[PDB]
């Protein structure tokens, strides 16, 4: 599923991630355009045999069980196949877990290096919510 903007932007809402550790939502929205272009399928291989699953791409190394990540963790306790769902819920859930790990958003490099300290009210411009 190709999210829209302000479609995404309800449903982070609705899924508690407005202002989940201070990032309010044109972050999380900005993040996914760029990590994903709002496409709940989209992947990425990394150098190092990790996979990043979905929306946020979130990634095969620590967060998710794809069984082809060697010397990896699960600390989201999901196969990461359930990142790819058009449902978010998995996605929005794992994202809390990794917020909250003390790197913040900074987890994301997408964001970092392109959402960061710019203004992320823009992608939530026009929205119903
Ligand atoms: C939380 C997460 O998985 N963040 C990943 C990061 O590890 C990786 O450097 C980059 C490119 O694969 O994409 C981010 O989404
Ligand atoms: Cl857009
Ligand atoms: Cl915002
Ligand atoms: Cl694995
Ligand atoms: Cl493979
Ligand atoms: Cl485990
Ligand atoms: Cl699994
Ligand atoms: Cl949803
Ligand atoms: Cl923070
Ligand atoms: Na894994």
Same mark, same amino acid.
């Given at each position: 599923k190709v999210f829209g903007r302000c479609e995404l932007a309800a449903a982070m809402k609705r899924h508690g991630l407005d202002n989940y550790r201070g990032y309010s939502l044109g972050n999380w929205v900005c993040a996914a355009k760029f990590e994903s272009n709002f496409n709940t399928q989209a992947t990425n291989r990394n150098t190092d045999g990790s996979t990043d699953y979905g929306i946020l791409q979130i990634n095969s190394r620590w967060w998710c069980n794809d069984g082809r990540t060697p010397g990896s963790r699960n600390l989201c306790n999901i196969?990461? @196949?359930?990142?790819? @769902? @058009?449902?978010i819920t998995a996605s929005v859930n794992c994202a809390k877990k990794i917020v909250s790990d003390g790197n913040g958003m900074n987890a994301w490099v997408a964001w970092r290096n392109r959402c960061k300290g710019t203004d992320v009210q823009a992608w939530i411009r026009g929205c119903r919510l």
């Open positions: 196969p990461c @196949s359930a990142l790819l @769902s @058009s449902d």
